[PDB]
Swiss-Prot record, chain A:
The chain holds residues 470 to 517 of 613 of the full protein. This is RNA polymerase sigma factor RpoD. Belongs to the sigma-70 factor family. RpoD/SigA subfamily. Interacts transiently with the RNA polymerase catalytic core formed by RpoA, RpoB, RpoC and RpoZ (2 alpha, 1 beta, 1 beta' and 1 omega subunit) to form the RNA polymerase holoenzyme that can initiate transcription. Identified in a complex containing RpoD, the RNA polymerase subunits RpoA, RpoB and RpoZ, CRP and DNA. Interacts with Rsd; this prevents interaction with the RNA polymerase catalytic core and with promoter DNA, and as a consequence, promotes transcription from promoters that require alternative sigma factors. Residues 1-48 are annotated as: Sigma-70 factor domain-3. It comes from the Bacteria. It is found in: Cytoplasm. Contains 4 domains, connected by flexible linkers. In the active conformation, the domains are in an extended conformation, each making extensive interactions with the RNA polymerase catalytic core. It comes from Escherichia coli (strain K12). Sigma factors are initiation factors that promote the attachment of RNA polymerase to specific initiation sites and are then released. This sigma factor is the primary sigma factor during exponential growth. Preferentially transcribes genes associated with fast growth, such as ribosomal operons, other protein-synthesis related genes, rRNA- and tRNA-encoding genes and prfB. Disulfide bonds: none annotated.
Curated annotation (Swiss-Prot), chain B:
It is an enzyme of class 2 (transferase). The RNAP catalytic core consists of 2 alpha, 1 beta, 1 beta' and 1 omega subunit. When a sigma factor is associated with the core the holoenzyme is formed, which can initiate transcription. InterPro entries: DNA-dir_RNA_pol_bsu_ext_1_sf, DNA-dir_RNA_pol_bsu_external_1, DNA-dir_RNA_pol_su2, DNA-dir_RNAP_su2_dom, DNA-dir_RNAP_su2_hyb_sf, RNA_pol_bsu_bac, RNA_pol_bsu_CS, RNA_pol_bsu_protrusion. GO terms for cellular component: DNA-directed RNA polymerase complex. The gene is rpoB. DNA-dependent RNA polymerase catalyzes the transcription of DNA into RNA using the four ribonucleoside triphosphates as substrates. Its EC number is 2.7.7.6. Keywords: Acetylation, DNA-directed RNA polymerase, Nucleotidyltransferase, Transcription, Transferase. PANTHER family: DNA-DIRECTED RNA POLYMERASE I SUBUNIT 2. This is DNA-directed RNA polymerase subunit beta. It catalyses: RNA(n) + a ribonucleoside 5'-triphosphate = RNA(n+1) + diphosphate.
Curated annotation (Swiss-Prot), chain D:
The chain holds residues 655 to 804 of 1407 of the full protein. DNA-dependent RNA polymerase catalyzes the transcription of DNA into RNA using the four ribonucleoside triphosphates as substrates. Belongs to the RNA polymerase beta' chain family. It comes from Escherichia coli O157:H7. The RNAP catalytic core consists of 2 alpha, 1 beta, 1 beta' and 1 omega subunit. When a sigma factor is associated with the core the holoenzyme is formed, which can initiate transcription. This is DNA-directed RNA polymerase subunit beta'. It comes from the Bacteria. The lineage of its organism: Bacteria, Pseudomonadati, Pseudomonadota, Gammaproteobacteria, Enterobacterales.
Length: 48, 1340, 100, 150
């Protein structure tokens, strides 16, 4: 769809083409990410 | 002069005529960007460099490959403003032209084959402003040019490596631009060795054998063949006379029949000269001379094929006999004189065990691949891949060049790939250095060091994205179908763009900029480091590189450090310098000829400089002759001294070019120490814009250019006449010639009002200008937050005294009056924002609506139907500004509350609060807000209202735009017709479009009629597209995260006024902190009852010595005095000519000033308005080094009719009487800071805690407790406060039961203690036991 | 533990137990099946690897990272250095009832 | 001027080739140090008791009433070398190499530095500053070790 479009297709456009409704799109979109490891120093310097 | 100069003139006292007007300043960043983008045909850079380096790419067959043609970028979808609005990165889209070329492999390359010569979108690309920045999620951010060690070749030696030796070892290092590294090294044992990438050692000769190679040609190469001839019994041997040089004669070295030399006798230069003289090459010599010498080459008996002696074998006399017998009355041998040409090679060779080339190949493999079973092609392909493959290896012929020069070749270019001659020439040169001829390199010298600008790094990221591409490419090429597989059927732009993102948001350099101060931003652009990948680290780095090198001069400001662990690592450039195109530097210099300084220029390197001999601009010319004094301070060789006059190559231009900008702007600092200088220029950046724009009156001169080049302001892009004005926009008519013919020449500028600084401070613009006035191009039209008339205003100048007062300025501390507070002048603004989200939950959607339970209606009052605040409201902590609620479950409770609600009996809610509220401890003003809602989620009531308001406002603005434009063009429409007949009122009253029927001169004019028709339609068409595009731009909803249904946000307005604790400083180190404001009556004051503004403690100066602040003070009293002369003359309302004399006199006062000016040139109201501008005090420029002089402070305080001592009898605010002695008085220009108690101080009673450890938190933002270091505990170790110890160990921190106990006991009045045991203890014990041991407690 | 997005945060450790238990599962699973001991060896070397890396990740072999490419904090590391317990949170400590 | 004529003479000697370079180094550096000392005597005698004030008598002087000197004599702030910095030539300068430079400073803060003179001040300035930043860790490390024993 990107090649066809040249840009990012929307949840609705793919709700059409993937053949299922925006419920499940937005649903799965809520789900698919991973945990981010407490011990990361979001303090750029080693303080936090 | 120019218009804005005329309005306010700053005097100057530099006298040395400068040659140069400064360049543009941020040229470097924009140029690297340009380089990266710009379509280089041939010198491939950045993009084209990448595609060229990589493409074409083919498959495994010999049919199919992919072929570059060209590329293109598009316009951005989003303008700049919508991007930072939406929190969107700005960028441009990308197309590239690809040709899927294949070849008929049945044919040889029967190229009439499938071709998909088409175009491909992939990935947008963030882009630069016309100013430099990149916005990321609407976050203007900056990335900085770095320096690193230039590639190539670098030699050195360490002093003391083994303790028994305590001696030096010479060693080499080299790298390419790309690919693996390589290391030559000696040992103490006079042997070269080798390692790659610091792999383990090798005798270099192993690899030499690896190079298709034999020992024969070694010994041909490195050494001469010391030839013998056994002429039937006895040894005769050839001899160049200069082989025996400083050599002790072993035997009675003689001739045909002549002794030049006895045994044990040094062969002087004389005997060499005799030997030379008499043409004597061969000498009768003892056979014994040989034994110990080494054969040159493998010799055999031809019948045998067997070595009577192997090559690289010491010689003897049994072998002498044997060889003479075998048919050898000549013997080459190896030359060896440590004086002349001595042994290192054969040492390593006899050490070199690997017998054949293949032993070399395999052991080289085996170090390269230890454990792994060697095969032939493994090692072969391996070695060639390392340094003979174009792919994994390049020099970036800057390298290649450098290597020619490290070899002194003719050439400069080549491949990115080695040759063997290069290698051995390095080997030879290295051993030559070992012998003493030549040197090793230096460090901290700038020709060893190369920059890294942006497009370089962009390019690197780009091509590694092409790696992440090309793997998958190759597979799907060799594997998939060939006829059907489109070029983009394989393409994944995702890792490419994602890596662009990673670098743009996770690099060390991707950074938020400092727009608190145009100084701070612009210098932040002009910062440089050595950090990150291919960089260094604090704990690993040391001292020497932080320090100065002489060759910084003219190229680096040495003044510029952050006062922290980056003591010398960080540093910014200087002023007038430039880059070598390669990534090194240059600097201009005035050529000097015959004594005559040539005004020409040559941007010399760090390297050419030391050769020549070069002069200062401090010199006093002999009026276009030569230098006046014989002993001229010249410099060459990396050092300066005194030489004659015609003896000069070059000269400097100006006395500043060493400096940076914040370094440049401090006057008199030649009279001042450096520590206070650098911390001053540091604090010079941390400044804050005040409410208004007060200038200084002491200057340097450059500040105009800085007020320009940030791009913060408007400019006269083109001169013209002011057309229309507003407090948010201003229109100009462009001059006729500056107006292009196709163009209407009507510029506008819509102006940035109240707006967020990244450090949360207020932003505006305002016209410093009037209407109906001419303007020459480049003039500024609206000043900025910290600027005035195109010049800086970081602070405010005002009154001072230097004396103690009752302890109220004890240690650098400050006292002030109250008057300032009544003038509010050091008052400023801030901005504070908040936000909220409409999510969807498992249970349902979070609802945004005014409806709430348990409603203290007080704050509900200011909310609307949808639960939203009305604009112009005033608030404070805890107030409720947005009503959001959440689908809730239900709960249960204890019998006591059950009975409670049973007697109350309020009922039935299954929804929970999620409303937004002000932080406790804040109060501000409501200004502006915004909602984002999905394109697909319905736009709420006021959401539609706001977007309707926006379509209104925008459509109004664009209506006005095209309206005015269209009037501008209907001007032409009416004008062009008037001299063909006339329809004087037959034209006007009847409708406009029906003028096409009136009097017509049939021949030509109908084309005009239908061209009028054409433009009438064209214009409304252009508005139609404007309308539709803009309206869809406005109405299109939001690409919001999953669950995020819509969000509102809010911006406040807050001000803050002065209070003790708010730091304050000027430009001289002159810090200080406040203890008090003072009533005006308490002011000590003068005979004339004018009290003072500031008092200061004169203790510390003769130790810190920022003495320019004194001269400044003198001048600060001085300058204003003239403004008062004039101000009286204005109120007294005197005359033109009086002031005219007064003033031109005042200008043409100093000794030998460079600037020269007239009045009579100018007309009257010009005089009036500059006089209006100067009444507060005439401003002045002190060039920091060629400033004015005390004679011109004193001539001047005279004219002000003051004590030239500048020091006065004053009287006491409290007692009225005179003090002992006088005190110096005058004005200095002062600054206040970010460091301010309101954002700084904090208290923490009791609140949140940690989770694993139950411990109080840190940070005022989350109500942070203050940690105590353990040395604070050591304190009461030395005191013995066991109970406070207990307290602060246990109850304030960890013990839950303890903290609770204490809470309730205090509210009982009870001040009594109870311990528990810290949670962390047991936590450990558990962890320990998880590590798997039985720790345990021996209970009592 | 979660955040607003239903997007969570985890320790450095949980994967250690996860890999360990899974490799045990593989091991016992393959002991049901009477394979050659070559793979038995390979699995158990992975086992001891995971074990002593849990005890100390960056002691013995090339240290172990996540997607971070930062190495993973050992148990031992938590007891250790300044962010070890002793020096971090047992001797110096945040405190209630104070201000500045 | 005396110093200039003398270094010109020693220049002529080193040109002649009798005297060496390190000898000359010690010679020049010592005589500049003597020049600084003479300047110090000059300025101190010309400041500390520069004040002549008469009481019931022709002339007599006492301790000066100048602000700078009494700041030095109280021990509140200042010191003779610091007053020399503002007023006199202040000694000579060691480059970051650790060497010591042959040509000391001529003017002062009152008159105004040279380009090169301040460019030269930079070296030892930054040297002492990095030391300011980076001698303290030794102290704290040391300290907690010491107490860890005891």
């Amino acid at each position: 769809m990107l090649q066809e479009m040249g840009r990012e297709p929307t949840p609705e456009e793919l709700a059409e083409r993937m053949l299922m409704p925006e419920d499940k799109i937005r649903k799965v979109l809520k789900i698919a990410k991973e945990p981010i490891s407490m011990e990361t120093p979001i303090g750029d310097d080693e303080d936090s | 002069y120019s218009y804005t100069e005329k309005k306010r003139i700053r005097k100057d006292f530099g006298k040395r005529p400068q040659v140069l007007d400064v360049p543009y300043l941020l040229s470097i960043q924009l140029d690297s960007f340009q380089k990266f983008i710009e379509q280089d045909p041939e010198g491939q850079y950045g993009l084209e460099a990448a595609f060229r380096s990589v493409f074409p790419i083919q498959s495994y067959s010999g049919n199919s490959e992919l072929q570059y043609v060209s590329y293109r970028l598009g316009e951005p979808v989003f303008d700049v403003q919508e991007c930072q609005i939406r929190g969107v990165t700005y960028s441009a889209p990308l197309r590239v032209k690809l040709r899927l070329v294949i070849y008929e492999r049945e044919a040889p390359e029967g190229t009439v084959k499938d071709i998909k010569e088409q175009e491909v979108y992939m990935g947008e690309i963030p882009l630069m402003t016309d100013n430099g920045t990149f916005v990321i999620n609407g976050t203007e951010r900056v990335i900085v040019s770095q320096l690193h060690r230039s590639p190539g070749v670098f030699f050195d030696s360490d002093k003391g490596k083994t303790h028994s030796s305590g001696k030096v070892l010479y060693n080499a290092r080299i790298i390419p631009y790309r690919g693996s590294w390589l290391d030559f090294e000696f040992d103490p044992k006079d042997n070269l060795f080798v390692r790659i990438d610091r792999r383990r050692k090798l005798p270099a000769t192993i690899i030499l054998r690896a190079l298709n190679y034999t020992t024969e040609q070694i010994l041909d190469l490195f050494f001469e063949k010391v030839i013998f001839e056994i002429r039937d019994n006895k040894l005769q041997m050839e001899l160049v006379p200069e082989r025996l040089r400083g050599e002790t004669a072993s035997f009675d070295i003689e001739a045909n029949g002549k002794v030049y030399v006895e045994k044990g006798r040094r062969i002087t230069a004389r005997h060499i000269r005799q030997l030379e003289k008499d043409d004597v090459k061969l000498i009768e010599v003892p056979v014994e001379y040989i034994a110990g010498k080494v054969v040159a080459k493998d010799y055999i008996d031809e019948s045998t094929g067997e070595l009577i002696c192997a090559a690289n074998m010491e010689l003897s006399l049994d072998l002498l006999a044997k060889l003479s017998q075998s048919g050898h009355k000549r013997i080459e041998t190896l030359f060896t004189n440590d004086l002349d040409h001595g042994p290192y090679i054969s040492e390593t060779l006899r050490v070199d065990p690997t017998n054949d080339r293949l032993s070399a190949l395999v052991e080289i493999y085996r170090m390269m691949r230890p454990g792994e079973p060697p095969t032939r092609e493994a090692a072969e392909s391996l070695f060639e891949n390392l340094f003979f493959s174009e792919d994994r290896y390049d020099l970036s012929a800057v390298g290649r060049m450098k290597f020619n020069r490290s070899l002194l070749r003719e050439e400069i270019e080549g491949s990115g790939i080695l040759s063997k001659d290069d290698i051995i020439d390095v080997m030879k040169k290295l051993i030559d250095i070992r012998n003493g001829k030549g040197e090793v390199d230096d460090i901290d010298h700038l020709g060893n060091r190369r920059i890294r600008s942006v497009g370089e790094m962009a390019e690197n990221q780009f091509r590694v994205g092409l790696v992440r591409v090309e793997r998958a490419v190759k597979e799907r090429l060799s594997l998939g179908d060939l006829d059907t597989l489109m070029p983009q059927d394989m393409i994944n732009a995702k890792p490419i763009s994602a890596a662009v993102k990673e670098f743009f948001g996770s690099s060390q350099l991707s950074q938020f900029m400092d727009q608190n101060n145009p100084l701070s931003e612009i210098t932040h652009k002009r910062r440089i480091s050595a950090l990150g990948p291919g960089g260094l680290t604090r704990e690993r780095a040391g001292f020497e590189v932080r320090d100065v090198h002489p060759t910084h001069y003219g190229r680096v400001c040495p003044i510029e450090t952050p006062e922290g662990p980056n003591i010398g690592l960080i540093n910014s450039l200087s002023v007038y310098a430039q880059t070598n195109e390669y990534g090194f530097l240059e600097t201009p210099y005035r050529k000097v000829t015959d004594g005559v300084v040539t005004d020409e220029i040559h941007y010399l390197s760090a390297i050419e400089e030391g050769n020549y001999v070069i002069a200062q601009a401090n010199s006093n010319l002999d009026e276009e002759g030569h230098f006046v004094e014989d002993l001229v301070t010249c410099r060459s060789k990396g050092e300066s001294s005194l030489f004659s006059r015609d003896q000069v190559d070059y000269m400097d231009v100006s006395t500043q070019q060493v400096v940076s900008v914040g370094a440049s702007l401090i006057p008199f600092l030649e009279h001042d120490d450096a520590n206070r200088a650098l911390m001053g220029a540091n604090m010079q950046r941390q400044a804050v814009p005040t409410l208004r724009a007060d200038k200084p009156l002491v200057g340097t001169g450059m500040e105009r250019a800085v007020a320009v080049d940030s791009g913060v302001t408007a400019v006269a892009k083109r001169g013209g006449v002011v057309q229309y004005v507003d407090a948010s926009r201003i229109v100009i008519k462009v001059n006729e010639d500056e107006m292009y013919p196709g163009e209407a020449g009507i510029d506008i500028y819509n102006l940035t009002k109240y707006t967020r600084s990244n450090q949360n401070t207020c932003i505006n613009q305002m016209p410093c200008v009037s209407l109906g006035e001419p303007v020459e191009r480049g003039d500024v039209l609206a000043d900025g937050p910290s600027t005035d008339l195109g010049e800086l205003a970081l602070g405010q100048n005002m009154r001072v005294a230097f004396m103690p007062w009752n302890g109220y300025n004890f240690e650098d501390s400050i006292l002030v009056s109250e008057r300032v507070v009544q003038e509010d002048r050091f008052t400023t603004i801030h901005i504070q924002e908040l936000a909220c989200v409409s999510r969807d939950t498992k249970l349902g959607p979070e609802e945004i609506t005014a409806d709430i339970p348990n409603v203290g209606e007080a704050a509900l009052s200011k909310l609307d139907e949808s639960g939203i605040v009305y604009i112009g409201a005033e608030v404070t902590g805890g107030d409720i500004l947005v009503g959001k609620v959440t689908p809730k479950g239900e709960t249960q409770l204890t019998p006591e509350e059950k009975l409670l609600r049973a007697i109350f009996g309020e009922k039935a809610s299954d929804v929970k609060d999620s409303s937004l509220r002000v932080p406790n401890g804040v109060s501000g003003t409501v200004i502006d807000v915004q909602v984002f809602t999905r394109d697909g989620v319905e736009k709420d009531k006021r959401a539609l209202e706001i977007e309707e308001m926006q379509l209104k406002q925008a459509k109004k603005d664009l209506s006005e735009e095209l309206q005015i434009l269209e009037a501008g063009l209907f001007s032409r429409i009416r004008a062009v017709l008037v001299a063909g007949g006339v329809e004087a009122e037959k034209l006007d009253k009847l409708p406009r479009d029906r003028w096409l029927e009136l009097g017509l001169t049939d021949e030509e004019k109908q084309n005009q009629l239908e061209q009028l028709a054409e433009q009438y339609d064209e214009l409304k068409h252009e508005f139609e597209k404007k309308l539709e595009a803009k309206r869809r731009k406005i109405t299109q909803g939001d690409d919001l995260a999953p669950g995020v249904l819509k969000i509102v946000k809010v911006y406040l307005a807050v001000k803050r006024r002065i209070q003790p604790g708010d730091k304050m400083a000027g430009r001289h180190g002159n810090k200080g902190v406040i203890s008090k404001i003072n009533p005006i009556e308490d002011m000590p004051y003068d005979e004339n009852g004018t009290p003072v503004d500031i008092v200061l403690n004169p203790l510390g100066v003769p130790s810190r010595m920022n003495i320019g602040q004194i001269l400044e003070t003198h001048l600060g009293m001085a300058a204003k005095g003239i403004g008062d002369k004039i101000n009286a003359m204005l109120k007294q309302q005197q005359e033109v000519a009086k002031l005219r004399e007064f003033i031109q006199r005042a200008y043409d006062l100093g000794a030998d000033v460079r600037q020269k000016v007239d009045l009579s040139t100018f007309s009257d109201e010009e005089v009036m308005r500059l006089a209006e501008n100067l009444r507060k005090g005439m401003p002045i420029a002190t060039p920091v080094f060629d400033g004015a002089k005390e004679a011109e402070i004193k001539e001047l305080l005279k004219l002000g009719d003051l004590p030239t001592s500048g020091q006065i009898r004053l009287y006491d605010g409290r007692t009225g009487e005179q003090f002992e002695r006088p005190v110096t008085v005058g004005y200095m220009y002062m600054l206040k800071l970010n460091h301010l108690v309101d954002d700084k101080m904090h208290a923490r009673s009791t609140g949140s805690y940690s989770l694993v450890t139950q411990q109080p938190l840190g940070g005022k933002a989350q109500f942070g407790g203050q940690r105590f270091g353990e040395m604070e505990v050591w304190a009461l170790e030395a005191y013995g406060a066991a109970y406070t110890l207990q307290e602060m160990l246990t109850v304030k921190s960890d013990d839950v039961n303890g903290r609770t106990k204490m809470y309730k006991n205090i509210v009982d009045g009870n001040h009594q203690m109870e311990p528990g045991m810290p949670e962390s203890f047991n936590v450990l014990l558990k962890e320990i036991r998880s590590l798997g041991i039985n720790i345990e407690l021996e209970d009592e | 533990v979660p955040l607003d997005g239903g997007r969570f945060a985890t320790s450095d450790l949980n994967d250690l137990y996860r890999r360990v238990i899974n490799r045990n599962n593989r091991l016992k699973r393959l002991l049901d099946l009477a394979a050659p001991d070559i793979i038995v060896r390979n699995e158990k070397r992975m086992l001891q690897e995971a074990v002593d890396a849990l005890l100390d990740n960056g002691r013995r072999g090339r240290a172990i990272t996540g997607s971070n490419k930062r190495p993973l904090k050992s148990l031992a590391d938590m007891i250790k250095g300044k962010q070890g317990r002793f020096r971090q949170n047992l001797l110096g400590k945040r405190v209630d009832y104070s201000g500045r | 001027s005396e110093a200039e004529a003398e270094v010109a003479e020693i220049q002529e000697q080193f040109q002649s080739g009798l005297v060496t370079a390190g000898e000359r180094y010690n010679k020049v550096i010592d005589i500049w140090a003597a020049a600084n000392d003479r300047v110090s005597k000059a300025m101190m005698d010309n400041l500390q008791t520069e004040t002549v004030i008469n009481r019931d008598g022709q002339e007599e002087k006492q301790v000066s009433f100048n602000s700078i000197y009494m700041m030095a004599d109280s021990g509140a702030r200042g010191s003779a070398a610091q007053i020399r910095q503002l007023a006199g030539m202040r000694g000579l300068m060691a480059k970051p190499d650790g060497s010591i430079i042959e040509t000391p400073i001529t003017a002062n803060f009152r008159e105004g530095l040279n380009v090169l003179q301040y460019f030269i001040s930079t070296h030892g300035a930054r040297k002492g500053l990095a030391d300011t930043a980076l001698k303290t860790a030794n102290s704290g490390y040391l300290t907690r070790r010491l107490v860890d024993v005891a």
